[PDB]
């Protein structure tokens, strides 16, 4: 980047709008229920096991 001052211009403008439409979707309880379903399927899956 560039030091000195300069950056004080659009400082507050970028703070309000960071990215164009941020990917903030709650598809699975704040993106956390899908992590629990993947762990449960590994403990009891289709792995062939003896008796």
């Amino acid at each position: 980047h560039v030091p000195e001052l300069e950056m004080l211009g659009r400082l507050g403008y970028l703070n309000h709008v960071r990215a164009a439409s941020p990917q903030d979707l709650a598809g699975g309880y704040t993106s956390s229920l899908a992590c629990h379903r993947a762990l449960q399927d590994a403990f009891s899956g289709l792995f062939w096991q003896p008796s």
Binding site: P3, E4, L5, M7, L8, L11
Partner: protein
Amino acid sequence: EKLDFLGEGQFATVYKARDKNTNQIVAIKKIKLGHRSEAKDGINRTALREIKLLQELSHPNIIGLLDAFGHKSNISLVFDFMETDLEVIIKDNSLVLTPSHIKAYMLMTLQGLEYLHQHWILHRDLKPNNLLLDENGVLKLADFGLAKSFGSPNRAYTHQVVTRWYRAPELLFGARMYGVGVDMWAVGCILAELLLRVPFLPGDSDLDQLTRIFETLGTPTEEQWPDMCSLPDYVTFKSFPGIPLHHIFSAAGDDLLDLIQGLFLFNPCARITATQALKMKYFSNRPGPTPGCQLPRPN
């Protein structure tokens, strides 16, 4: 306590001022930064690992370090003083001649890069002047303003960095991954500059630098350097063959050609490193290098 002024630099002005307590001469390199702005980054951590981790690592081929102090705005560096550099030997001043003294330069340069690669440290700032010389003639580096701690995998990082004169062929195209060949590319470029005493790669930006390198070394083919068309940022040029390296340089022995060819290899996975370079037939002959006493110094 200001003493004398030297010169400027890329992003830091060198000041020759004697520091306190320690009687050694300190060359303060003040980095121009900001402090007037509110939410300002101020100090950049690109040199934080330099003035905090260099005190632990001790090596003769690596520059020293004493203390460090600052406050966002003015970050005064505390480093040992050096006599001259390497650009003054070739550029402008042409009276200082080194008859068969280049062997001592590459011998002390590969040892400094080998010690940094062992601790997972890359010197991503190679340019024909960092090789600082002291009174005893000990070849040491300059500053670590672009160092980084890497590991086994190689991911994407910064681009369009490093001095445009000494640029790796994989860095000009904007490749996301890299490796040891980044620091091993400018090793032969500095060696090629001390032979003919002329700029070996006088190029401009990333587009002009590709023309000078390819017209002299060649174009990476499929058998040479694979994986080339898969990169998005790619340009199609002419089918450059390859100029030999034993006719461009006049004063060059047979053992010297065994090292220059291995350093200018377009394959980073097959490029020679520092351990295999010191075990070649060039650093094990009759013309032994000089310790540093017989090496001349500029005016």
